[model samples]
Target: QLNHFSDVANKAANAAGDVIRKYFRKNNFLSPVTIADQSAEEAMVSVILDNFPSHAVYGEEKGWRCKQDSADYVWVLDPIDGTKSFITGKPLFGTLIALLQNGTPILGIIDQPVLKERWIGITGKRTTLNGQEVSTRTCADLSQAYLYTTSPHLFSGDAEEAFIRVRDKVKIPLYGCDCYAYALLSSGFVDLVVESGLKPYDFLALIPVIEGSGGVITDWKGHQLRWEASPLSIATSFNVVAAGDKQIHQQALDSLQW
Candidate 1:
């Protein structure tokens, strides 16, 4: 059943990817924000719901569909994970889909149609980039790690300080990659990703990909995510710290104190 669901997720991702690709930067002016996002979500939701009528769906643009708690399967969709980049005609945006069973993430897909690359992961299985298996790399010291964040402005007060503490220690600290950064982490291109102000849709789909690739992902407080109900459910926020190496993850947690 999980394997079948994995295939379904891949298909849905491709369907959404096609819609996004068709509309991407095609407008005469750089204004594809809502149109591209809506089209991608509509295509993705239609494909997933049509195949699994009993499953619930929680989408960033479309909101929740069906009774999520009552359903055994729930799909979390972020039609465009990097909307700001997408609207700006950047190719860093991605389509994210995650499958949750009994409130636990079991499968996830991150598809970038512009790059023709996809990352897929299923529980108890290794993560795959396109079709080949991939793993995260190891970094023994914080001074040798490459850290990434979506933006420095996403944090404030003590959160900002915590992020800076970790950032100052890393060999390189970069910003503005969004979900694409997580994909890069799974592929061993980056070492750690620390970010705040995320909703469920922003982080859920990236979880399986990182964890399945032998990486670790957790909140700033060093706690794993709760699958049953996310902070987004109540209009709150989530903070994440993901690392390719277990030692690096621990060091990150140590530095983040807020």
Candidate 2:
């Protein structure tokens, strides 16, 4: 049972995992919004607020739970991070959970339920995947790096042009993984993930996970993510550039200058 906000996030996320198991691929490919997404999100909301009522919860499907005026600690949830993959029966889809303090993410979890993999990252600690410490592998130059994104087609206008600039410089740039790309980056399978048109729930939970794994994650402009207002309002500036190697991260940023 969850007594506090330690690894207690597992309680909320594990419940979410069960909800996914209950609904996985049953509705495959009709409506992208499956019951799995809604129920898993509902399960997480229940698990967290059941234990810590003072804190608040926000999700991609249902974004309102907090009073907004208060809630210094808000838990952001993405029940099924990769919706299309889930419809396609891909195990790379994950559940993302993050606890934010004053709108800055301080704890995060990425759970791939089908694979039984969970990556946990907390403030002031190293990242752990299924209870083992994990770190990103080194790739100091963009020419030597392995890059991943959800899809090249997802970017537009300035975002597309900027992505092309970074895309042109990398050795290998693959697509179609979504948040799983970051998971792989933290585990040393890959080195960078740059994407745009993301919401706060999409990227907020990822910061602690990447940072704790000895990687860097920030907007293309190199700003740390946080909200001075509602996080929903912060999506206008959601371009992210994450890299296992700090030097290449800076290079990626320079390529993003538009």
Candidate 3:
């Protein structure tokens, strides 16, 4: 059953969260920041593998752990989605996991351990934050929308020009929220998220969460993130645009044209 899948995912996430929170509190200054990443990823990977040994896994720290080409059931993970925030002692970081069927995410989890909040989504179902359903608020126009990006500096060359075109159109723009921004967008607290220089693990899990909550997640060209059908042109970086409102999504996409 799908609920069983979610249940096991919840269990794995909780287990991984325990490891992350333990280290966050310890903040062992002597160790590299990757210590937290490696520890948490090991725990998450173990739980997933133990529960679904045959499923494939692609993680931020470990890359593809299984035969990606033939596996129809795949798991995409960012054990610590915001490593910078975590190492800086900020509570903004979260753990991200997505279950994919044939390279399309069907379920997703965004868990903020330090803040004690978690957001979960399954395709065709309403998104929930800490067990309560939530949805996005609509904005009729780009000028009325609140925009967000991890950092403007992430953009480069023509990508920078495209992003600035959107940035300049918005009335209010915020920075440095990472995956928390996507959670906020799902909860109706934000309107848009535009960022470049992302890997598959960075945005894969956020897709269902955003889409399940009445938002849209896509590449800058208004294309879907189903890389299996249409593989990424640039493997290392992805230019993403997430809009809480459909109209706002179109408006942002239009502005991204260079």
Comparison by TM-score, 1 against 3, better one: 1
Candidate 3 lDDT over 91-126, as tens digits, reads 898889889987789999999998989999998799
Every candidate's lDDT: 0.85, 0.83, 0.84
- Stretches of candidate 2 off by over 4 Å are 1-3, 28-33, 67-69, 228-237
Clashing pairs in 1: none
Segments of candidate 3 deviating more than 4 angstroms:
25-32, 67-69, 229-235
What tens digits encode model 1's per-residue C-alpha lDDT throughout 136-236? 99998989999999887889878998999999999999989689999999999899999988888778888999999999999988898755533245534
Query: Candidate order by TM-score, highest to lowest?
Result: 1, 3, 2
Best by the TM-score measure? 1
- Candidate number with greatest lDDT: 1
* TM-score, predicted candidate 3 vs. hidden true structure: 0.93
RMSD of each: 2.0, 2.3, 2.5
Tens-place lDDT digits, model 2, residues 1-258: 222686568898889998898777676333534677888888888878877777878765565576445677788888988888888878788899988877788888988998999998888889999999999989868999899999878998989999999999999899997889998999988888999877777777788999999999988889876643244543344788899989989999999894
